[PDB]
Amino acid sequence: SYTASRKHLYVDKNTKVICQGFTGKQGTFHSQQALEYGTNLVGGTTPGKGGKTHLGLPVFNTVKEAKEQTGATASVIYVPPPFAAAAINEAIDAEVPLVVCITEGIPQQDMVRVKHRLLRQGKTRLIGPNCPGVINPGECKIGIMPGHIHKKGRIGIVSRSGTLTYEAVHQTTQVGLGQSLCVGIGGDPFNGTDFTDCLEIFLNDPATEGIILIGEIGGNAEENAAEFLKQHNSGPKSKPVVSFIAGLTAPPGRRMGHAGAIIAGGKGGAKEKITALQSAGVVVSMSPAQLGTTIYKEFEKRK
Amino acid sequence: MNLQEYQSKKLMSDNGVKVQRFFVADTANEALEAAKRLNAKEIVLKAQILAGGRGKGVFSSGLKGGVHLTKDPEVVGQLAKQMIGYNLATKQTPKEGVKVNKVMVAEALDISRETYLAILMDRSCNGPVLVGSPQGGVDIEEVAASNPELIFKEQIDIIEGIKDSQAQRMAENLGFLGPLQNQAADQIKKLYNLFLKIDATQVEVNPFGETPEGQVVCFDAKINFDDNAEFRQKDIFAMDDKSENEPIENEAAKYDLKYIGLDGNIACFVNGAGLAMATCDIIFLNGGKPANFLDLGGGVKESQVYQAFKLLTADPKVEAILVNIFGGIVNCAIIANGITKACRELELKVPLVVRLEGTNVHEAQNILTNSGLPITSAVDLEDAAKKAVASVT
Ligand SMILES: CC(C)(COP(=O)(O)OP(=O)(O)OC[C@H]1O[C@@H](n2cnc3c(N)ncnc32)[C@H](O)[C@@H]1OP(=O)(O)O)[C@@H](O)C(=O)NCCC(=O)NCCS
Numbered sequence: 001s002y003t004a005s006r007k008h009l010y011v012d013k014n015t016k017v018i019c020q021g022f023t024g025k026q027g028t029f030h031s032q033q034a035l036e037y038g039t040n041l042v043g044g045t046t047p048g049k050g051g052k053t054h055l056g057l058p059v060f061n062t063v064k065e066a067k068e069q070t071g072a073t074a075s076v077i078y079v080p081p082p083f084a085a086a087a088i089n090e091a092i093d094a095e096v097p098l099v100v101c102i103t104e105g106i107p108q109q110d111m112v113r114v115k116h117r118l119l120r121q122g123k124t125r126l127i128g129p130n131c132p133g134v135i136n137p138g139e140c141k142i143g144i145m146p147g148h149i150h151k152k153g154r155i156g157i158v159s160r161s162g163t164l165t166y167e168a169v170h171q172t173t174q175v176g177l178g179q180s181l182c183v184g185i186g187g188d189p190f191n192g193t194d195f196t197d198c199l200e201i202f203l204n205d206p207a208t209e210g211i212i213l214i215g216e217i218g219g220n221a222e223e224n225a226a227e228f229l230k231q232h233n234s235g236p237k238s239k240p241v242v243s244f245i246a247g248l249t250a251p252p253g254r255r256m257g258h259a260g261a262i263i264a265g266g267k268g269g270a271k272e273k274i275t276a277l278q279s280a281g282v283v284v285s286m287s288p289a290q291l292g293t294t295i296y297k298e299f300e301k302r303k
Numbered sequence: 304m305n306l307q308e309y310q311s312k313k314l315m316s317d318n319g320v321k322v323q324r325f326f327v328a329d330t331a332n333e334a335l336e337a338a339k340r341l342n343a344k345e346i347v348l349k350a351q352i353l354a355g356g357r358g359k360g361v362f363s364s365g366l367k368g369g370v371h372l373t374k375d376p377e378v379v380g381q382l383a384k385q386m387i388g389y390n391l392a393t394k395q396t397p398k399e400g401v402k403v404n405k406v407m408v409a410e411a412l413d414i415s416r417e418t419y420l421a422i423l424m425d426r427s428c429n430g431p432v433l434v435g436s437p438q439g440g441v442d443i444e445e446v447a448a449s450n451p452e453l454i455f456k457e458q459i460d461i462i463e464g465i466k467d468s469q470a471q472r473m474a475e476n477l478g479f480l481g482p483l484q485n486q487a488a489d490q491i492k493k494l495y496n497l498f499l500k501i502d503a504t505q506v507e508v509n510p511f512g513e514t515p516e517g518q519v520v521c522f523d524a525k526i527n528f529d530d531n532a533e534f535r536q537k538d539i540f541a542m543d544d545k546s547e548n549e550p551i552e553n554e555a556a557k558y559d560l561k562y563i564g565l566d567g568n569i570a571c572f573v574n575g576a577g578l579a580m581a582t583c584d585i586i587f588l589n590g591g592k593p594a595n596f597l598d599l600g601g602g603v604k605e606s607q608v609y610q611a612f613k614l615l616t617a618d619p620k621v622e623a624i625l626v627n628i629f630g631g632i633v634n635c636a637i638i639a640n641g642i643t644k645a646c647r648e649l650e651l652k653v654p655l656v657v658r659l660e661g662t663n664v665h666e667a668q669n670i671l672t673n674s675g676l677p678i679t680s681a682v683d684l685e686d687a688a689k690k691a692v693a694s695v696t
Pocket of ligand 1: 020021022023024025026027045046047077078079080081083084086087102103104105130131132144162163600601
């Protein structure tokens with residue numbers, strides 16, 4: 001089952017990362033930043049560029065060779081949209097435990113084909129595409145997020161929005177709570193990881209004492225998350241969950257930036273998602289600027 | 304993406320999908336000759352605009368109705384002369400109307416049975432799904448409300464492709480009988496293959512039915528395209544009709560900026576789609592009306608800031624601008640510099656509420672401070688929304 005790979009979401013200081021699209025513009029820049037943060041970046045791949053060094057690290061022609069020569073456990077993808085799906089598939093083929101795809105603009109049909117392969121294996125866990133990534137503050141950072149607003153703490157954060165994540169992170173750092181694990185699942189309609197995948201990890205994680213779930217219009221991932229919380233976050237040691245759902249004022253039939261952020265056929269509305277979550281015991285913050293103070297109220301109320 | 308009726312139907316007919324035989328004319332005489340070439344017992348003349356309600360619309364020539372029926376090719380030419388070059392005003396257009404450059408000259412077909420058929424990607428079931436109903440010629444959303452038992456679904460495996468059993472079963476559920484059921488099942492397969500070939504997010508045929516002469520025909524259809532697949536759908540995206548779009552939305556498309564014009568007076572550009580949605584939300588929650596939705600993407604460049612300001616000037620409703628930028632490794636002082644630069648060079652005097660979170664904030668606050676411009680620096684998103692609302696009437 002693909003649900004078996006959920007544990008691979010939790011990066012730590014032992015995580016070793018390779019970069020697909022290593023020699024590219026953004027692949028190079030964020031690889032440099034990864035090395036700054038302390039992320040165990042051990043090399044990368046670019047087809048036809050193997051046998052070279054880049055940023056003092058080995059470059060490989062294939063993921064399999066990169067994995068075998070470095071013992072990498074995670075891959076991050078900065079491959080352009082026409083070839084990014086093939087990059088994900090190669091990563092799945094090489095059975096890389098964790099794959100984070102940053103690429104925005106992958107055809108939805110491409111990702112449907114990718115998910116077909118993904119759901120029929122259990123070795124590889126995929127985050128994204130069109131996602132910021134994942135960070136274990138002070139231990140491992142894979143993706144785009146700024147690692148200096150972070151602070152190792154007690155709140156697990158999962159979001160369909162990268163910039164809203166930064167709001168939730170900054171606020172939880174401000175109130176001194178900090179973050180245990182932060183996961184951006186991206187704004188594409190077809191991805192490798194949803195809310196329940198992360199909630200599973202958050203609930204089982206001793207370091208996580210509270211949860212911030214950030215959603216928006218489109219799809220039914222928020223509704224699925226609420227159902228999961230009713231069944232799995234109901235005593236005797238249930239963790240507080242605070243949420244914010246963007247797009248209360250969003251017009252119907254328009255793709256609000258994100259490919260998956262759209263209200264079509266009366267489905268995907270933000271108000272229904274708010275209602276479903278509240279019924280699951282989630283404290284939904286009316287304001288995006290109050291996520292930190294809200295989760296603080298719940299956290300200190302845990303006596 | 305927006306396709307005219309003749310563009311989408313040409314796309315369907317080229318891929319084996321049965322539609323009305325038709326021509327497209329640029330002039331009255333072209334419409335006349337097109338009518339002759341059809342060899343049809345009855346002809347239908349349709350003005351080509353994107354908005355609906357063409358049947359009860361009015362031209363600036365005085366002609367009532369953008370859809371007419373006749374057995375006479377010469378009448379087609381006469382009526383086309385009263386259409387082409389003029390504006391067509393419907394209940395879904397501005398009162399000024401929309402300029403009609405082309406008309407469709409098609410074979411008019413009688414409709415015995417009307418069904419609904421749609422193909423789209425199921426976000427929940429991860430793959431293509433057939434959505435059908437024997438109740439056609441109606442907004443399918445209402446059918447789901449009143450009669451959910453009449454909505455039939457077929458989950459398709461993307462690797463396996465559409466099965467003959469699936470196509471046949473849907474055709475039966477749509478109400479088609481005998482040879483008409485086989486003809487419908489085949490068309491469904493052709494519609495599915497078209498759906499994949501053109502990278503559509505949805506292909507909706509309504510009505511999907513049959514003529515008295517016993518032929519299954521897609522009478523009317525709507526096709527929505529996946530923007531992410533433009534690089535491999537160049538011919539299709541080149542056919543894009545932007546004449547009925549918001550002019551500001553069109554200029555924004557040039558600079559790859561996601562702009563959606565709204566009803567308010569508080570403009571705002573924000574890096575990130577979620578943050579922009581949240582910004583519009585919190586502006587409303589504090590008693591304001593957002594003038595627009597504007598996403599610049601996480602990686603916010605200085606040139607994007609300039610173009611955004613350039614866009615927001617074309618909106619006369621804008622009384623204030625809320626700038627909220629969090630993220631993107633272009634420091635805040637550079638952003639602030641580009642802000643002041645755009646303000647002076649674009650002759651802008653509406654008040655700004657600016658929230659910048661990142662590196663070099665103190666320097667950014669300085670660049671904003673000594674700019675001598677009406678710029679207020681907020682501390683958080685709620686603070687920014689409140690100060691923006693307070694800046695307007
Ligand atoms: C993925 C993305 C970052 C790439 O942009 P880019 O870095 O400017 O692209 P480049 O062309 O410079 O580099 C890509 C590299 O990948 C390489 N590449 C291509 N196919 C590859 C494959 N299958 N495997 C590995 N590398 C591959 C290319 O060869 C190129 O390297 P080269 O120039 O050394 O030959 C960009 O398309 C994108 O999606 N940006 C937006 C990201 C975003 O919004 N994320 C949301 C986070 S909230």
